[PDB]
Amino acid sequence: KGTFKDYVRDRADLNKDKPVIPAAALAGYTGSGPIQLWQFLLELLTDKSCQSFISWTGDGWEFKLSDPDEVARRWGKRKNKPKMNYEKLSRGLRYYYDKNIIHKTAGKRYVYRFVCDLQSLLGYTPEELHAMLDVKPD
Amino acid sequence: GTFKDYVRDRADLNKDKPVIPAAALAGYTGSGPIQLWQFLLELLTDKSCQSFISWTGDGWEFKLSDPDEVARRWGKRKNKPKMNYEKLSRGLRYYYDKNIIHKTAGKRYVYRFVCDLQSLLGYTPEELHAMLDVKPD
């Protein structure tokens, strides 16, 4: 693993740690202090090194969890919840649905869609991010 | 305005470019949420924060020029609006006992990382001082 210096370098060689929308930066913008689940998901969704397990579908703010277990694992590591899993993550996403932030796409599993006005908050359009991230639509 | 402008504007002020990001350091240590010592290392490696916190040029020694400001940013980062240096100082005693941070004897608001921070971070003190254009005191 080496030192932190090596850690940053090793991950840079793998094209990691370059998200378009960093969760910590977004948390500072919204004033939430610690990062929240929706900010974490936007970071993963704008980090090309994460497309193997989470990605945009190409339809607006819709995204899918190709590997829900890996998303839950990374969330647990990010928040020091070693027992984090999809079941708890799903319950969390259910709370976001009540506040009309994230909705589930019927007919497809592990597919969700940001329903709030994300374009006005972030200053990015859905298609703009898709182009940057080389999103291949489903 | 928007988040994009928020990133732009702050970038023009050379903000948000710390050598040791706290969240990145937390990922390296596996701590999950950032901890106070990581938060301090971010500020200490953020050129835009040198007005209220900076190194002294002597190894891992650093000083809090505006101890009230560093506490405000710590409270805003952990949703503690009533955070003040009086409370923040209480939390620093934990790092005293664990021989992570020590107060410089005979100097107030001056501390030093007494752990092998070079082996952890991979940086020497002089290296970060040069990158940060620190003026020794």
Binding site: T30, S32, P34, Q36, L37, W38, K79, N80, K81, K88, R91, G92, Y95, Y96, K99, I101, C116, D117, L121 | G32, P33, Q35, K78, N79
Partner: peptide, 16 residues
Amino acid sequence: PSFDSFDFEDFPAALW
């Protein structure tokens, strides 16, 4: 939009 706290006994928010 507003992002009110997400803190429940079945889904507790982390802090420290």
